Design a protein around this ligand. Structure first.
Ligand code: FMN
Ligand code: FMN
Ligand code: FMN
Ligand code: FMN
Lengths: 340, 340, 340, 340
């Protein structure tokens, strides 16, 4: 029973057992408000590894306390976070899943109390706070925080790191001309608006030589913002800097009313894959095994990412295999229930 | 929810109530072996019209008796066939379906007793018979038989006509260099191997002014054969000759093995639609309403063709509406059962 | 996996190929308003025989014009009706299905113009017309119409006859104390209210030796009306008179609605089956193969009746076999679609 | 639609939020071979509590080391087991589920090294070991082990206790004349063969005042073994002793090969419920919301037990609610996916 959905995939000596990925999903469940792993996370993430998902990516994890979305986020801004993340790594990997971490900074979308920072002092909307415009010292300090976060992730035992450059947060605010009005070398041209992302990538590669992903918002959905043609030259540069895969999302940069439907972001993933010759991940209302097999076999992406479907059924790989008429290995404790 | 699957579609005066098409499927049910419509056909085709399919296309209907696949095929080589075909048109259109017919000739894949014909004297495999190499008289007669079929179909009251240029049958044999070895003006170059189809199209347009479809095999799956790049200039020719829509299939030219999977021929249909600027229809392992709405909304085709799924469930349009969370009109007798 | 659902069942020399029955459903499609079969019926009923239903029972067919529910009903009050009914017998049985007919009289629920009849001059509700109370001449005449209908059904070639004694129509109106207030020998005790049904059964048996069904409403859903415990002695008497199977429905006697749920009338079918030791049919929100196998294997009924599900999917037996993990014979034309 | 499946149920002061139960299932995952709770159990059981199951019952938990089925079973023979079991109770109850424990002793079906015990010295089959026939002192010691296990369950915080009297294990060996050949007061009449179970129940009630379940095998499937008529007087006695619910299974006493089908043990649950006037649990090939609602609404049982279906989909309650057209509360972290 040949499917491509259940075939392995290798990225520089890390091999995933199938093409299914659990997409990063904030849980707002750090009840002690100090960034640390709690019981909620130690059941939530291993459930999907028992369910035979090949790669589990943690929710947006803040590289400074000021870069959290909410006070109940996970964090990696302290050497004290390494012990709890290491325990989580061990509980997921015992089931044969590999594990990744999404490194985040919320920028002008931070909801935490106190000062918040951004490339330019413009609020996201009339209902949100005006941020402080970063100085050159703030830029150097934030690039160093991403480096320190990557070192701690290596020390905890993660297999993959992803940089969050999407959905209107700090790095996306530097990339889009809707939010970046700067007059120094970090603004004022397509090359200068890339510079913050390029320096974050270079700083992570100084301490991390394993698989590296970047997640992007391929369109701003605005007449004066970016579209996928602007991201084709940016993806070519990321490949030269040693990024292995682009995880292709869209929007949340500007309030916009957009039409949503099955696979509505798949064309962005295939444009980047074919025009820049780099591996890609697809995401957005992917909910069935039949659908996912078509995406992979026609070369539209290399990995399929699922978020809301794995909140409804965390053992979706069993259901997807039945739909495709194939079989997969089961946890030995569940063999009497996993009949094909 | 407004969907594209249940939106109308108009071609040169003919309006289809939705984008769903029942693909042509031989039934081998002419038990008198004279090509005439039988009781089986008068239940089989009207069942799918009650089911709310927008357009129903009859099985390959042979334009000469020598051009049948089997002795139990439907035929249109006599004025005697008009009467039984007219009754069938009337039974289908009662329910709001439009109806079309696929004119065919089997060439060297014919299984009927006696002499069979081809563009060159090469059999399909080592297990099949060797065809006679067609003379110039044979060519003009066969072109003429296609014109007579179209005239008879217009007389019977069909809405749409389709020419069968695919799956290794007679027109496909002229198109392919794997089977056409001719040294006259019907072989030896891209312009020459197109000529037979070009003439068949012109002869049909002499007697028929309604929507005209053509079905192609977009790849031979063979190192020395055709690929979709060869069919882009052919589709531009057909558009200029007044063909309205290309029905995109593939294969069955060369005895071989190929791996099939959901939507495996959709990339051929999108390449023809985009590069030759002509409407297309997609076919091949399309089974769900979720899948069909993706094809249409990402612009990969204009109509979706189903075969085996309509043998398993002839009222598939109700089930597809329910999967997409929309509603469609039901036959008034069935309103207590068709609850959305 | 062998199932009872797809095992044969023999009654008095008639063998059904499985336990699945198309329950009677009015179509309101006699557009010439003379009771004759139309093209609608000649597609509708054979579609379910192609889908492999074992027994197809026609909609309520009126034994007098006055006994029609509406002007567009099927009828059997004239020898002229035999010809069209026999065409429909031939079209259904060609596929291996057996065929039955439900003989009806609408009573005080009739909607046709002019005088309507009933045991007692009481309207069904405030909004309906008041009926004439039947004389003894009217009772004898109406019994004779049921006998003539059965003779016509034998002549047309039916395999099974069913008497409609349910859903508040004429015979149900004699059985219930809610509707029957008579003071002659047709009212005022359990034996007197049974008398009209007992006399219809004897008159049919004078002309018909094949399988005989009766459909009942086993509860009135009223504190002063009938319950299943009243029907147990009536079923013991029906067995002595030569009825072969009781088709067990409920309600529609008092003008109120009730809360329904899956299998809500199965306890009535099993109480009649076990306490009167007679074969029974179950009906009401039976929609899946898993459900149908449980009814049969636990001895709750001998045949399963489906109405609304067979309007949504007329090839349900293929889907039920896949759900149960078993295989069934397919029509030869559909073998490449009906994969198990 | 209000359903009974999602209505609450109260037993002697414990309220369950719905009627769905996770049936006991051995995991053979105590890798330290000392009966203690491990990381496997701390993810496996809370997964179904997040999935909104109302009552979770732990796998057979051995009251002595000699009563284990395998060396990898959970146990409750030491005060050192209480700490790990209490942690597991807290992790499950955090989500609104209630939690139970099944107390077991494998008798002659034990696989551990050394001596094993039974009412009589007859092996289970030719391939298994001959057990020691128990003395009166062995009987007193084993009843005391069940009491000590019940006391530790209370110390750990469980809501419900179940006694395992089924599937051929030690208490079932005393009940059945196939395995009990004793000539003293524990064998040779229906009252004498009940005596071991009756003394276990009384010893548990001395230390436990909460809800008490007993699981039975209602048939041995053997001409000289027990049938459901033997268990009607047993269930009347258990009610008098203060048992609150009978959990009704069958078989695994003698090597019969019975033919199973959906709901094949539900008629046993309904016979005990109606004849002894005691609440019952139904189990056995129950997989759909449609099926479970019929069992409850037709009064066949009070709770529905699932085993293999919750190994395939641990969030089954979400799917069953959708199938029945109702809604239920979701974990707040999952509200964006649990849409209905
Ligand atoms: C509760 C929730 C939390 C999410 N958190 C993140 C996140 O931390 N980082 C991120 O890049 N996307 C996040 N997303 C977006 C998803 O990863 C995904 O891109 C989106 O929901 C579309 O995929 P789906 O249709 O499979 O849900 C979140 C989505 C949800 C519903
Ligand atoms: C029984 C059967 C008969 C068919 N007959 C024809 C035919 O007469 N002409 C044609 O062009 N294709 C014919 N086909 C091919 C189908 O039209 C369709 O292209 C193919 O089955 C793939 O679509 P599907 O996956 O929806 O079945 C037939 C297929 C089947 C199974
Ligand atoms: C449109 C329609 C017509 C029906 N006509 C009849 C009828 O003529 N005679 C009869 O006994 N029941 C009739 N019924 C009742 C059905 O036979 C069946 O008893 C009922 O619909 C419950 O079964 P279901 O849940 O499978 O639909 C009809 C039901 C419908 C929806
Ligand atoms: C892996 C497995 C372990 C089981 N362990 C137990 C057990 O410890 N105690 C018990 O009474 N039944 C046990 N059973 C039987 C189940 O509880 C249940 O009665 C049976 O599987 C039928 O229900 P189902 O069709 O929903 O699986 C087990 C079944 C399985 C498949």
């Amino acid at each position: 029973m040949e499917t491509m959905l259940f075939s392995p995939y290798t990225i520089r000596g890390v091999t995933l057992k199938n093409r299914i990925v659990m997409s990063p999903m904030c849980m707002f469940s750090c009840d002690t408000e100090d960034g640390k792993v709690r019981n909620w996370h130690k059941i939530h993430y291993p459930t999907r590894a028992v369910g035979q998902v090949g790669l589990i990516i943690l929710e947006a994890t803040a590289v400074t306390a000021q870069g959290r979305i909410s006070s109940r986020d996970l964090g990696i801004w302290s050497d004290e976070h390494v012990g709890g993340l290491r325990e989580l790594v061990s509980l997921v990997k015992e089931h044969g899943a590999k594990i990744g971490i999404q490194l985040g900074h919320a920028g002008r979308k931070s909801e935490v109390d106190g000062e918040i920072i951004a490339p330019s002092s413009i609020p996201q909307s009339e209902k949100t706070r005006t941020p402080k415009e970063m100085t050159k010292a703030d830029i150097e300090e934030t690039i160093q925080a991403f480096q320190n976060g990557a070192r701690r992730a290596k020390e905890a035992g993660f297999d993959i790191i992803e940089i969050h450059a999407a959905h209107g947060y700090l790095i996306n605010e530097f990339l889009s001309p809707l939010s970046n009005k700067r007059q120094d070398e970090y603004g004022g041209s397509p090359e200068n608006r890339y510079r913050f992302l390029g320096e974050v990538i270079d700083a992570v590669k100084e301490v991390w030589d394993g698989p590296l992903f970047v997640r992007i918002s391929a369109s701003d959905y605005h007449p004066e913002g970016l579209t996928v043609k602007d991201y084709v030259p940016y993806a070519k540069r990321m490949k030269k800097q040693g990024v292995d895969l682009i995880d292709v999302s869209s929007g949340q940069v500007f309030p916009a009313n957009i039409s949503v439907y099955p696979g509505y972001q798949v064309p962005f993933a295939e444009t980047i894959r074919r025009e820049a010759e780099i591996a890609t991940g697809a995401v957005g209302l992917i909910t069935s095994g039949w659908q996912a097999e078509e995406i992979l076999r026609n070369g539209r992406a290399d990995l399929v990412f699922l978020a809301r479907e794995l909140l409804r059924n965390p053992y979706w790989p069993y259901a997807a295999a039945k739909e495709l008429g194939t079989t997969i290995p089961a946890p030995v404790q569940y063999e009497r229930g996993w009949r094909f």
